[PDB]
Amino acid sequence: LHKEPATLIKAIDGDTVKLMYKGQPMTFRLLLVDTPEFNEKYGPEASAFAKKMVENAKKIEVEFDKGQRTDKYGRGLAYIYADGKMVNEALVRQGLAKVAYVYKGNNTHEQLLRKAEAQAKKEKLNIWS
Ligand SMILES: Cc1cn([C@H]2C[C@H](OP(=O)(O)O)[C@@H](COP(=O)(O)O)O2)c(=O)[nH]c1=O
């Protein structure tokens, strides 16, 4: 996989964010994770964590997987990096997201994320508390 440039337009919630990619505004949905909706338990904390991450970053990057790059709602599907750290992974590692929506052929970082989930679960963090 390859990291590509993007810039932040606006934080949205734990697992979606608005970025400019190839010069065009798009909403990205983070691959392989599910954060709680803002209205649910840990939703506000997931949103806050994801917002801090992308707002503090000097460099945002988008990494597509091998399969579909847009979902049925026209959201981009990608792994999002903030100053080299994967947002998808960081949410999971903090117990603010579950590994989820693992579809065949867009699952390159599955085992990396499951390893983070296991560690979050072990330390009983947030969702796992
Ligand atoms: C993460 C992801 C979500 N989706 C679709 C599945 C779900 O369909 P449904 O809306 O029919 O439940 C929805 C979940 O996104 P959200 O968790 O943002 O609601 O997005 C994909 O198709 N591919 C993906 O990789």
Ligand SMILES: [Ca+2]
């Ligand atoms: Ca969600």
